[PDB]
Design a protein around this ligand. Sequence first.
Ligand SMILES: CC(C)NC(=O)[C@H](Nc1ccc2c(c1)CNC2)c1cc(Cl)cc2[nH]ncc12
Lengths: 39, 156
Amino acid sequence: DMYIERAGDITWEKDAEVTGNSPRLDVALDESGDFSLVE
Amino acid sequence: GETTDGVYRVMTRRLLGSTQVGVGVMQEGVFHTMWHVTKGAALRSGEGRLDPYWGDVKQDLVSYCGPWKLDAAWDGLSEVQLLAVPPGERAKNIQTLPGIFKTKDGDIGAVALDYPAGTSGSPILDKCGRVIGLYGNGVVIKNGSYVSAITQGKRE
Ligand SMILES: CC(C)NC(=O)[C@H](Nc1ccc2c(c1)CNC2)c1cc(Cl)cc2[nH]ncc12
C-alpha cells in the first residue's frame, strides 16, 4: 500500500548547482509509454 | 489528510522497510505524478485516502483528487531547475539547460540529469516557479547516462 510524505516547497533557488548537458536526441514513443532511440 | 501545495515522496511498505517508488506535485488540491510509479493505485496521505481521477499510460501521467492542473511550458530557450527529491536524501534544486527529443509528433524538452529511479515524478521548474513538467520518463544513451523528457499533462 502506497503513501505520500511532504518533501519541500516548489520554488526556484537562485544560485543552485548548474550542471548537465543539452542534447538533441531522435526518439520514438510507443503505446506502452516507453521511449526509445532512433538512428 | 495533508493537502498542502508542494513536492511529496511516494513510498511503499510491501518491500523491505520503507521504499521510495517515486515523487509527486500537490497543487490546487490535486496530486500529480508519473503513471509507472503508482500504476494507478490509490494513495494514502496520513489517515486520508487519495484516489486516481485521470490517467494515461502513453503520456505516463496520473492525477489524484481532480483533473491535471499543471500547465506551464518550457520556452525552448531558458535554463530550468530539476527539484530532485532522491530516495532518502533531501530535496535539491539542480539547474540545467534542456535539450530536445525529436519525435514524429513534435519536439519535447529533455533534461540530461542522472538520478535513481525513485526520483521519478520530480518537478521541473521555470524562473517564475511554475511546474513545466515531471522528470522520470526517458531514455538511456550510448554512455549509459540517463536523459528524461519534460513530461507535461494537458489542463481543462
Ligand atoms: C526504462 C527507463 C529507461 N525509463 C525510465 O525513465 C525509468 N522509469 C520508467 C519510466 C517510464 C516507464 C517505465 C519506467 C515503465 N514503463 C513506462 C527510469 C527513471 C529514472 Cl528517474 C531513472 C532511471 N534510470 N534507468 C531507468 C530510469
